[PDB]
Each structure stands twice: as structure tokens, then as C-alpha cells.
Design a binder for this molecule. Structure first.
Ligand SMILES: *[C@@H]1O[C@H](CO)[C@@H](O[C@@H]2O[C@H](CO)[C@@H](O)[C@H](O)[C@H]2NC(C)=O)[C@H](O)[C@H]1NC(C)=O
Ligand SMILES: *[C@@H]1O[C@H](CO)[C@@H](O[C@@H]2O[C@H](CO)[C@@H](O)[C@H](O)[C@H]2NC(C)=O)[C@H](O)[C@H]1NC(C)=O
Ligand SMILES: *[C@@H]1O[C@H](CO)[C@@H](O[C@@H]2O[C@H](CO)[C@@H](O)[C@H](O)[C@H]2NC(C)=O)[C@H](O)[C@H]1NC(C)=O
Ligand SMILES: *[C@@H]1O[C@H](CO)[C@@H](O[C@@H]2O[C@H](CO)[C@@H](O)[C@H](O)[C@H]2NC(C)=O)[C@H](O)[C@H]1NC(C)=O
Lengths: 117, 48, 48, 49
């Protein structure tokens, strides 16, 4: 809130009579979508591995709604613009287990895979 | 506890800009903005 | 009567000069209250 | 390879005190409540030596 409203991007300052005049350019949403999000994702393994998103959300790509729990295919989106993409080691991090995380048994991301090559 | 010295001495107390309903609405806005409210990096998403 | 007139006009000038400084103080502290609402009620501050 | 903790400490579980350097089993605790747990990739990062 210190540099204007919204999400601050850039600011400029000019001279004014008796002082300084400031223009804060901020990012402002106009339309939005309602997305279904996960807190994190688990492995059902031993020892169990869990991931959480970096700067964004694990979402469903709900363009074709009313699907099943194996059709719970999860994607990553950034927090400021809805555009789903595959979950990788670039946009997730390993965390300790939490009871709110969804337990996945099929369609696993590559960070959540039992690594046998 | 009235201020009757207004009408004798010649000054006036002006009422505030908002009424108690609007101040109550402001603090309920503050109370309801606590859970969630841009869970992540920016300020553009709102998680419930 | 002109003694009372000149003394009362000087007293009103002192009252006006007091109210100007109090209004300016209150408008600075309203800006501080806005910072407190934005950084403590609606976020987690990183300021110790 | 060298690791450091994330938001916490590498501590001894020193309820059983007076051990040797071979019996230095290290654990992780978070910095606001003492509860030792195993060191993993979820509470450590790689650092330069
Ligand atoms: C996101 O979800 C909310 C659910 O609360 C939607 O709000 C409803 O929208 C419909 C259509 O505009 C209204 O008839 C309902 O009265 C709304 N419900 C409430 C409780 O306000 C909202 O429209 C959804 N947004 C999008 C983009 O789909
Ligand atoms: C999420 O669903 C949308 C469907 O709305 C997918 O968008 C399609 O993407 C393919 C890319 O090969 C295009 O050929 C289609 O024209 C797109 N459809 C629409 C309506 O835009 C999107 O690809 C899905 N996301 C992921 C990661 O698979
Ligand atoms: C995913 O599976 C785990 C099993 O490890 C579930 O964790 C249990 O959660 C309950 C509360 O709902 C706790 O009382 C148990 O102690 C937890 N088990 C363990 C071993 O800690 C978890 O609830 C599941 N989550 C989902 C979303 O299905
Ligand atoms: C650190 O040492 C304490 C002993 O003080 C361990 O606590 C015991 O844990 C077992 C199983 O977890 C319990 O059955 C005992 O009742 C506990 N004893 C006490 C006094 O709390 C603790 O498990 C050790 N830490 C680790 C990570 O192994």
C-alpha cells in the first residue's frame, strides 16, 4: 500500500510548485475466473514426498467440468494471470507433510515421482 | 452532557463526515479482509 | 468598549492559530493509521 | 556437498546428553518451538562451503 493501490509496477516523480509529484503505475485486474486450488500434493509413498507452489497456485484446468478424481490433473498457474501449465521443478518446492494436501496415486508430476530410471 | 455554550458564546460544533453506520462498515471491511486476501506474490488474486 | 473589542479579536486569532496546527497534526496521523491498516491488519509486515 | 537449514536450526536431541562425535546425530528444529525431526530436502538447502 505504500506506492499506490493495486500491485505496484513502477513510479515516476516530477517537480511541482513547492515539492514533488508522484505517478505510481500499478497492475489492475478487470475480469477474473473462479479456480479450484490445492494446498499441496502428496505421493502416498514411504517416505512420502510433498510439494507446494512457488508464487502461484496448483489448479484444475476446469474448461470441461464435472470430472473424476483420476481426472484431477493438476497444473500450475501464476497468481496474477490465469494460464495453466505443467508442474515442474521450476514452479514448486518440497515441503513437509500436511493433512490438507491431496493424495495422488496416478498422473503424478515429475517432482513427485518415485525416481527410478 | 450538552454543549449549550455554543448558542450563548457564538461558536458551533460541526458534525463529522460519516455517521456510525458507515464507521461500522469500515471496521467490518477491515475484519473481513484478514483471512486469505492475496495469499501469494502479488495483490491481484483473492483466495477464500 | 474598544478595549474589549481589541482583546477579543486577539484571542480569536490565537484560537485560529491553535486549530490550524491541530488539524495538520491530525492529518499526518491519519496517514500513519492508513500505513498501520495496510501493513498490520491486511498483511504480515517484515518490519521488526 | 554442504547444507544449511531453512527457518530453523540443526540441533542435537540432547535429552540424552554427553555423547561422542560419532554419536553426533543431528536433527532439525524450527526456530520458534523445540521439536527435533529428521533432516530432509524440505528443511535444508545447499550452500557453498
Ligand atoms: C465466482 O463465484 C461466485 C459464487 O459466489 C459467483 O457469484 C455469483 O454469480 C452469479 C452470476 O453473476 C450470481 O447470480 C450469484 O448471485 C453470485 N453469488 C453470490 C454469492 O454473489 C461469481 O459470479 C463467480 N465468478 C465467475 C467469473 O464465474
Ligand atoms: C486448458 O484448457 C484449455 C481449453 O480451454 C486449453 O486450451 C486449448 O489449447 C490447445 C493447445 O494445443 C489449443 O489447440 C486449443 O485451441 C485451446 N482451446 C481454447 C478454447 O483456447 C489449454 O491448452 C489447457 N491447458 C493445458 C495446460 O493443457
Ligand atoms: C492424505 O492422506 C493422509 C494420510 O497420510 C491423510 O492424513 C491424515 O489426516 C487425518 C486428518 O484428516 C489425521 O488425523 C491423520 O493423522 C493423518 N494421517 C497421518 C498418517 O498423519 C490426509 O488427510 C489425506 N488428505 C486428503 C486431502 O485426502
Ligand atoms: C529425542 O529424544 C526424545 C526423548 O526425550 C524422544 O522422545 C520420545 O519419543 C518416543 C517415540 O517418538 C516416545 O515413545 C517417547 O515417549 C518420547 N520420550 C519423551 C521423554 O518424550 C524423541 O523421539 C527424540 N527425537 C527424535 C527425532 O527421535
Amino acid at each position: 500500500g505504500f506506492c499506490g493501490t493495486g500491485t505496484h509496477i513502477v513510479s515516476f516523480a516530477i517537480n511541482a510548485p513547492n515539492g514533488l509529484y508522484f505517478f505510481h503505475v500499478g497492475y489492475q485486474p478487470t475480469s477474473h475466473v473462479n479456480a479450484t486450488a490445492a494446498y499441496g500434493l502428496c505421493n502416498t509413498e514411504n517416505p512420502q514426498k510433498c510439494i507446494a507452489p512457488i508464487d502461484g497456485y496448483f489448479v484444475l484446468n476446469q474448461t470441461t467440468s464435472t470430472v473424476a478424481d483420476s481426472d484431477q490433473q493438476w497444473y500450475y498457474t501464476g497468481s496474477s494471470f490465469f494460464h495453466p501449465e505443467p508442474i515442474t521443478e521450476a514452479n514448486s518446492k518440497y515441503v513437509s507433510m500436511d493433512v490438507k494436501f491431496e493424495n495422488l496415486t496416478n498422473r503424478l508430476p515429475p517432482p513427485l515421482l518415485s525416481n527410478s530410471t | 452532557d450538552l454543549i449549550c455554550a455554543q448558542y450563548v458564546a457564538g461558536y458551533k460544533v460541526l458534525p463529522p463526515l460519516y455517521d456510525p453506520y458507515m464507521e461500522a462498515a469500515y471496521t467490518s471491511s477491515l475484519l473481513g479482509s484478514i483471512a486469505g486476501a492475496s495469499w501469494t506474490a502479488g495483490l491481484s488474486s483473492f483466495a477464500a | 468598549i474598544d478595549r474589549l473589542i481589541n482583546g477579543r479579536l486577539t484571542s480569536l486569532n490565537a484560537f485560529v492559530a491553535q486549530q490550524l496546527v491541530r488539524t495538520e497534526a491530525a492529518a499526518r496521523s491519519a496517514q500513519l493509521a492508513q500505513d498501520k491498516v495496510n501493513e498490520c491488519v491486511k498483511s504480515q509486515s517484515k518490519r521488526n
